[PDB]
């Protein structure tokens, strides 16, 4: 039991580090959305008065 638990330890340590980067990536997409919506809405208003 001791050896098998020790052997599986490296896998958890390495692909935890794998998870960490993808978190920040999806956060960056969540940032990218909003300012795209606001440029859309201001463009629509200017078009309307045209």
């Amino acid at each position: 039991a001791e050896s098998r638990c020790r052997e599986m330890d490296e896998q958890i340590r390495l692909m935890d580090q794998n998870l960490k980067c993808l978190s920040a990536a999806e956060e960056k997409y969540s940032q990218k959305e909003d300012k795209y919506e606001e440029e859309i809405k201001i463009l629509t208003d200017k078009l309307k008065e045209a």
Binding site: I42, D45, K46, E49, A50
Partner: protein, 54 residues
């Protein structure tokens, strides 16, 4: 896309922008100055009105 020339443009209200475009196309101040007769006429008006003042 960080200079203030971009900045005021998206801080413009739309109708003020369009009025700027229209009166930009219209060019009233240039016509009034370019016309000789009315220009020197209004020069005479203000000059001898000033002369009547003091």
């Amino acid at each position: 896309e960080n200079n203030p020339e971009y900045l005021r443009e998206r801080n413009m209200a739309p109708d003020l922008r369009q009025d700027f475009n229209m009166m930009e196309q219209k060019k009233r101040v240039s016509m009034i100055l370019q016309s000789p007769a009315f220009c020197e006429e209004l020069e005479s008006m203000i000059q001898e009105q000033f002369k009547k003042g003091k």
